[PDB]
Design a protein around this ligand. Sequence first.
Ligand SMILES: [Mg+2]
Lengths: 168, 450, 129
Amino acid sequence: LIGTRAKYGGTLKNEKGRRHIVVCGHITYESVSHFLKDFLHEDREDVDVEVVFLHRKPPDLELEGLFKRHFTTVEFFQGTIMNPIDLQRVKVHEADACLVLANKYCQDPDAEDAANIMRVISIKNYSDDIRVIIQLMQYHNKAYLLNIPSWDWKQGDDVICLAELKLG
Amino acid sequence: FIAQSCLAPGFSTMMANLFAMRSFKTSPDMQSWTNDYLRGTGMEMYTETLSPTFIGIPFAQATELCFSKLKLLLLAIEIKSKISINPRGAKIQANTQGFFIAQSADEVKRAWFYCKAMKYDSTGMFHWSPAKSLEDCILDRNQAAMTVLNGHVVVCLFADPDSPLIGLRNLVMPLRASNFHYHELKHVVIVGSVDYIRREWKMLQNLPKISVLNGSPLSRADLRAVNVNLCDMCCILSAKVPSNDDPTLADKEAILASLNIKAMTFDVYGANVPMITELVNDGNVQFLDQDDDDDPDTELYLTQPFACGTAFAVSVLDSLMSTTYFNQNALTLIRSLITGGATPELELILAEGAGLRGGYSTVESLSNRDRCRVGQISLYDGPLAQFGECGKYGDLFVAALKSYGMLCIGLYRFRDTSASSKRYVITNPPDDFSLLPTDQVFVLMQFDPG
Amino acid sequence: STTYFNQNALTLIRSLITGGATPELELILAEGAGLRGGYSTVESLSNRDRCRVGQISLYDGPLAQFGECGKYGDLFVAALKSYGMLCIGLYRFRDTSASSKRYVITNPPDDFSLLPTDQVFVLMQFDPG
Ligand SMILES: [Mg+2]
C-alpha cells in the first residue's frame, strides 16, 4: 500500500525566459487535439510557447497518447483552476494568457456558461493583469463577463461565443 | 442570522466571530482597521454566577458597573429557566447565571468574587394575518413597476420547482416579531419561481406584508421592478442541490448574481446597495470583493466580505457544533437573539399542522411584546450624536444605558476615514476607544409602546 | 489559437459575420426586454451605410465583359472605381464543360484568368432607395 502513489501533480518546472499558457475547462481528446493542431502547427513561424493543461480528472488512454506525442511542448497537471493552491502550481502570474474551453455536449448551456465564467473570476482574482480568452456557449451570457471589474477588452480579454460564431 | 442582518447589517459577522475560535495575530505590517477588528474577534461569551454584592440591584445598574469597573459586558441573566437579553427593571436574585462577553475567562471570574472593600399569534410573540392567499400576493412585472417599495427586504431565490425545501419562514418570522410595530415592519418581496414558493407557502399565509414576483434574480428587469436600489437589504439564497461535479463551483448563481447587482446603475449605484450573500463554500468569499490586497491564502474571518458583513458562510454552523458541546448555554443565547423569540410551546402549536394559529390579545399576553431587539443606531444626528466627535466608547455606553436603556454591543465603522460606503464590525471596543462622527453602534433597543 | 496570436482577428470576424453587433447592443439585451425598437432619426439612419458580404456573377450586366479573356486585377480595379465593390475571391465551377457545384478561390493573383461562369465574392456598399 505504501508503494503506490499518484503520477500527476507537482509544481510546474521553471525555465529561464519561459513563455507558457494555461488551458483549463473541458479537456477531452477531440477538443485538445483540434487546438493543438493550430497552436503547434507545422508551418507556424518559430515561436516557442509551452501549453499547460489543468484538469481535475486524470487523462484517459485516448488523450494520454496525445500528450506523449507533444511531450516537449505540452505538460499536464491534475488540479482545479478554482483552487488557489493549484493556481500557484501552474505559475499563473508567469503565464502569458489563460484559455478556458467549453463543453459543447452539455445538457444545460446556461449551467456550463456560469461555471466557465466563474473560472474567469478565480483567475482574475488571483492575478489582475492576466489575459483570459473564454469559450462561451450562449450569447446572452456575455453580459455576465462585463460585470467583472478586472475584465478589460482593450487589455486583451476576449470572448469566443460558439453559438454566435457557428450560426454567423 | 441573515434575518438579523436585515435589521442590523454586519450582525452575522458579529455572531460568527463571537461563538467561534479566533486566533489572534500580531504583525507590524497591518492597517489600523485590522488592529481593531482582530481584537474584537477575540471576544467570547462566558457564563458565571454573579457576586453576592450584585444581589438586590436592577440589571441596568449591574451591567454598567461591570463595564465601568470590572471591564466586562453583561448582556443577559438567568431568570427562573428564561433568558432575558438586557432586561428592564429586573432585580437580581440569589445565584443568577449571567452571560458575559470578554477576551477570556480571566475577567469573567472577576464577576464571581467582587466586593466594594386577532392581531398576534397564540404565543403573542409574532404578528398574524387572516391567511392571505398566494394568488393575491403574486405581483407581475407591470404591477411591481407601478408600485414603489422603499425600505423593504428583497429575497433573491435560486430554486428549481423540484428543489429541496428550505424553510423561508425562518427568515420572515424574525422580521415579523412582536417587538416591531406594524408601521415599522419591513415589506418582504421574494423573486423566484412561484412553483417552488407554492410548495412552502402554507407557513407564510399568516405573515403580513409578503409579496411574490415571478422571474429570476439574475434578470435585471425583475430587480429594477422591485427597486432593489432602495431596499434595506437584498438577500441572495440558493436552494438548488449542487451537481457535485466540483465542490468549489457549488455556488455559481450566487456569485454571478452578486456581481450583477453591483454593476447595475440606476437613474443609483449598485455597489452602494446593501447586500448579503449565502455562500456554501469558504474559498469563494473573496470573489465578492475586488479592491482588496489579500493573498488568496487568507483566513476566512480576515477576508474582506466576511469582516464587513456582506457575506455569510454556512461553515460557521458546523463550527457551532463544537461551541454547543463545550457550553450548553451557548445555543440558548443564540436562539434567543436571532429567532425573535421562539418559545418551546410554539413548536407544539406548529406540531398540530394548522400553521401559525392566531389568538385574541389579552393584557398579560401583550406583556410578551416587552423584550429587547437587535438594532443599529447612528451618531450622525439626534441628542446622542454629541459623542461622535472626541467621544469615548465608555461614555457612549454609560449615557445610552442610563437614559435610553440601550446596550451598546459593538461598532460598525467605515473602512476609510476620508467613507467608501463599506464598513467593518468591531466587537466590544475598549473603554478608552475613540469614536468617529460617522460610526454606527450595535445596540439592543427596548420596546416603546405607542 | 488564432485569437491568442492576433487580438484583432476576432474583431474583424465579428464585424463581418454578425451584421454589426455594437457593444451596447449586448447592454440592451441585458435588460431582458428583447430587441427593443426605436424611432429612426437622421443620424441613427447613418448606421445603415456599411458594407455587406455578397456574391455577384459575370453572366450578365455591364461588368460581364471581364468574363472572357479578362484578368482578375482588371475586374478588381474596375469594380472598385465605378461601384466601390471590393473583390475578395472567386467561386468557380469544378468542371469547365458546369456540374452545379463550385469551389472557392481566395484572392487570386493579378494575372489570374477568369471564366464567363465565375462568381466573385464582393463587399458591396449600401445604396439608399
Ligand atoms: Mg471568538
